[PDB]
Amino acid sequence: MKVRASVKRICDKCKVIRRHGRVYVICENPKHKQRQG
Amino acid sequence: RMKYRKQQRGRLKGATKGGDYVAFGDYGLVALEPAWITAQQIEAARVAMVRHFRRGGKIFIRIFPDKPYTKKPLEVRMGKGKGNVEGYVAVVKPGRVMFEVAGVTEEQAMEALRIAGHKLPIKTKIVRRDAYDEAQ
Amino acid sequence: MEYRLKAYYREGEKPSALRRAGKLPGVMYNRHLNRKVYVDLVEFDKVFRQASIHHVIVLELPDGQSLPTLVRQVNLDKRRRRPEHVDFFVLSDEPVEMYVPLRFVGTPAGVRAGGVLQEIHRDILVKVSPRNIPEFIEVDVSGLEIGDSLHASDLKLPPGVELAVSPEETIAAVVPPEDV
Amino acid sequence: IGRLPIPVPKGVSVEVAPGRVKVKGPKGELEVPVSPEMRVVVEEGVVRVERPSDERRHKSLHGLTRTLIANAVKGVSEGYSKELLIKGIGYRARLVGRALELTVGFSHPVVVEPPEGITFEVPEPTRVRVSGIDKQKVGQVAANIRAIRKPSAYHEKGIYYAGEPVRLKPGKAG
Amino acid sequence: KKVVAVVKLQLPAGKATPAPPVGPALGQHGANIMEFVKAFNAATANMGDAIVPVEITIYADRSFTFVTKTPPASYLIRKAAGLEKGAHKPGREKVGRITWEQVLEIAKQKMPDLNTTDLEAAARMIAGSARSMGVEVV
RNA sequence: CCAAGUCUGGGCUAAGUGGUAAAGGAUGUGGCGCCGCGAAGACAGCCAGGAGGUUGGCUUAGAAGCAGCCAUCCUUUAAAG
RNA sequence: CUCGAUGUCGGCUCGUCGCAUCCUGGGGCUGAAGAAGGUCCCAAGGGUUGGGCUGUUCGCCCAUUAAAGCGGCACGCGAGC
């Protein structure tokens, strides 16, 4: 899941993973592909 | 918005600071870098707060919907007497005392405001007085 | 309790340089005697902060002249707050100008009643009692709804009694966040 | 203090080379990398990673070279085998010698060929996995197999590392 | 598929298969309506009109039931007390309000199963859960 | 490229920012104040218990935390949801 | 700027970049079983029909199709109709 902006974790244990400036949240919930990079 | 019964056509253009500051409940929105602001949008924040809160504990206010603007026509050429009044707003430009009580006893009120504004019309922050303030 | 480190050149310029240093301008005033001393912020503040220490004076040590002071005027700088100049009064004996800490128990009957929330107008009081008043001018009242409001009247003047303000006007009241 | 501590037993051929620390044990003189400032020691039984400063880059670096060569060696002591469990009524597992095999994708020609330290263990074939030598290389290959037919968190006929509890997405009506 | 362990069932003594807690409930959860129900009758039938809570299953001691264990706090309080359903709203309404002594008394009355049991525990719990429903102190 | 230090001195980024933009969103990077804590020996790592009226309000088919509108306590130490 | 002058619609004929991608693939996602859908990020390579009526580009209808995309260049084109 992508959104140029917003990404604010939610699978509650939802993770702030820095990947090439790629502001991406990694989790255990398909729902949370937090892609804002 | 509100400014009911005014008195005249319009203001104009300028601005750089003021005199908003104190506190008044300690659930405050310190406007920061701005200009006027839609009395409506304002209502936005109004609502925003109102709802966040468990829907009752009453907030306060601050800067009034005091001014009137015109885009003049609706989109024509340009020459009328600047006629028509179409927007009505508040005018705060140097970080100000946007006053929002309510009794949320919480960074909850914080939140409601927080975004009401984060949204609102600009750059601003929030807090509570801590240099008190003495009146007559 | 408090203290400070002295001034020289004031009104503005130098003091500014101070702000820079980490020291904001200080006006030292007493019944018709006065000179400028200077503000080292950080701690200045801490104490200030006390607040109870902003209403109710304390002892400032400056060059050894252990003296009594309260805030009587100050310029906190809008642009970020903090100050533009800090002003105090060292006091002999005659304390009349007192805006001291006010507490009261609004013995619930508000938000735990009509939902009504309690708005406080005074929170603090400005009356008299020469160099003698704590951190708690106090009162209280269970009435918290009906449209209820409590005033400078009912008041309830403890120990060193001395209303120096107005014949009522209210201390505060119960606002219907949603009626009652 | 604590970001550089390891013991180097076995008579391990734990020896510094030209830019690479060569850790030799069962077969492979595993190359556990070396940066110019890091620098390290291995005396009697003690193996230590050095810290030529204490900035972010280095600190991580420490954790690295340390756990890594750490690996290199503990490894060389043994070799490295991978614990993979195939499980799926839709799959078969047989070695063939130097080759994959196995299938669920109904056209079975599944011919792989264990790169190196990698050997195939099919005693099952449910419990069936691999062995390697190179900490990662092994993991990687395992993933290779796994993924190539594995996923299934709603109905499952797959290859599973240890066999993580993996999701259980319900279906039609219920 | 069939999860096996004591299933808690809150019911009306004298009765025998409450639609909600014993109809489906017992049945699919791990208990059973009519039979657990009638052994129950045999028992809770003499204690049922101020709240009857029991946990049941085919359990150790080799039998069917498990433990009949004092009516929930608030339910028995009110149930000895007076009005009807929950006070529609507690705290704010202040519609149901009991009396000190009266509280300590019914308190000791049912007190037995009390967590460790005592006068303070009984009366205090009364006030607590009492308010909880709408049974405030007054 | 074309005249003149690929000066010296102390810093910060490293995206090429050099070489153009906001609201805004962040375990970037570096810098300074308030808290809890290693000997009421910490936290991440990790053993075991995750308590007894709690499983009280409308819906009550269900809030009987984990449908939703009210409360916001009682017993009791893992300590207290 | 342009008038001692720059020929403006539509349509031909021949086009040429763009991607906010219609069709093509690669994709994480689902309120994904399959299938087929819908939801975003990557990628312009190639592809991107015929009629009808209307001077209309637009558009509605006929029959298909993988699809039968939006739009840049005086809304490209008279020293080429």
PDB file of C-alpha atoms (C1' of nucleotides) in Angstrom, chain G residues 3-50:
ATOM      1  C1'   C G   3      -1.216  45.283 -37.985  1.00  0.00           C
ATOM      2  C1'   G G   4       4.108  48.223 -44.592  1.00  0.00           C
ATOM      3  C1'   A G   5       0.517  42.488 -41.602  1.00  0.00           C
ATOM      4  C1'   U G   6       1.179  36.106 -37.900  1.00  0.00           C
ATOM      5  C1'   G G   7      -4.254  32.851 -43.271  1.00  0.00           C
ATOM      6  C1'   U G   8      -8.521  31.477 -36.813  1.00  0.00           C
ATOM      7  C1'   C G   9     -12.691  26.257 -37.321  1.00  0.00           C
ATOM      8  C1'   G G  10     -13.299  21.411 -39.265  1.00  0.00           C
ATOM      9  C1'   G G  11     -10.758  17.635 -42.525  1.00  0.00           C
ATOM     10  C1'   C G  12      -7.559  15.531 -45.017  1.00  0.00           C
ATOM     11  C1'   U G  13      -2.139  13.877 -46.140  1.00  0.00           C
ATOM     12  C1'   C G  14       2.765  13.004 -43.047  1.00  0.00           C
ATOM     13  C1'   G G  15       3.189  13.340 -37.853  1.00  0.00           C
ATOM     14  C1'   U G  16       6.630  14.071 -33.358  1.00  0.00           C
ATOM     15  C1'   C G  17       7.535  14.155 -27.961  1.00  0.00           C
ATOM     16  C1'   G G  18       4.519  13.292 -22.709  1.00  0.00           C
ATOM     17  C1'   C G  19       2.675  10.288 -19.170  1.00  0.00           C
ATOM     18  C1'   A G  20      -0.895  11.730 -14.450  1.00  0.00           C
ATOM     19  C1'   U G  21      -0.495   3.808 -18.788  1.00  0.00           C
ATOM     20  C1'   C G  22      -6.446   2.461 -22.428  1.00  0.00           C
ATOM     21  C1'   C G  23      -4.558  -2.177 -24.142  1.00  0.00           C
ATOM     22  C1'   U G  24       0.527  -4.604 -22.998  1.00  0.00           C
ATOM     23  C1'   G G  25       3.716  -6.714 -18.513  1.00  0.00           C
ATOM     24  C1'   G G  26       5.972  -6.243 -13.219  1.00  0.00           C
ATOM     25  C1'   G G  27       4.088  -5.543  -9.296  1.00  0.00           C
ATOM     26  C1'   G G  28       2.494  -5.126  -2.868  1.00  0.00           C
ATOM     27  C1'   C G  29      -3.480  -5.086  -1.626  1.00  0.00           C
ATOM     28  C1'   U G  30      -8.486  -6.998  -1.010  1.00  0.00           C
ATOM     29  C1'   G G  31     -13.882  -6.619   1.988  1.00  0.00           C
ATOM     30  C1'   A G  32      -8.315 -12.120  -2.460  1.00  0.00           C
ATOM     31  C1'   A G  33     -10.528 -19.296  -2.300  1.00  0.00           C
ATOM     32  C1'   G G  34     -11.082 -20.124  -8.254  1.00  0.00           C
ATOM     33  C1'   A G  35     -12.177 -17.216 -11.491  1.00  0.00           C
ATOM     34  C1'   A G  36     -13.143 -12.501 -12.734  1.00  0.00           C
ATOM     35  C1'   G G  37     -13.127  -8.190 -10.571  1.00  0.00           C
ATOM     36  C1'   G G  38     -11.635  -3.266  -7.679  1.00  0.00           C
ATOM     37  C1'   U G  39      -7.019  -0.523  -5.051  1.00  0.00           C
ATOM     38  C1'   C G  40      -2.159   2.016  -5.452  1.00  0.00           C
ATOM     39  C1'   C G  41       3.869   2.080  -7.107  1.00  0.00           C
ATOM     40  C1'   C G  42       7.118   0.684 -11.615  1.00  0.00           C
ATOM     41  C1'   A G  43       7.493   0.601 -16.521  1.00  0.00           C
ATOM     42  C1'   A G  44       5.673   4.328 -22.815  1.00  0.00           C
ATOM     43  C1'   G G  45       7.438  -0.897 -26.163  1.00  0.00           C
ATOM     44  C1'   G G  46       4.117  -1.872 -29.452  1.00  0.00           C
ATOM     45  C1'   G G  47      -0.475  -1.717 -30.211  1.00  0.00           C
ATOM     46  C1'   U G  48      -4.312   1.977 -29.598  1.00  0.00           C
ATOM     47  C1'   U G  49     -10.828  -1.007 -35.726  1.00  0.00           C
ATOM     48  C1'   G G  50     -15.555   0.097 -39.240  1.00  0.00           C
TER      49        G G  50
END
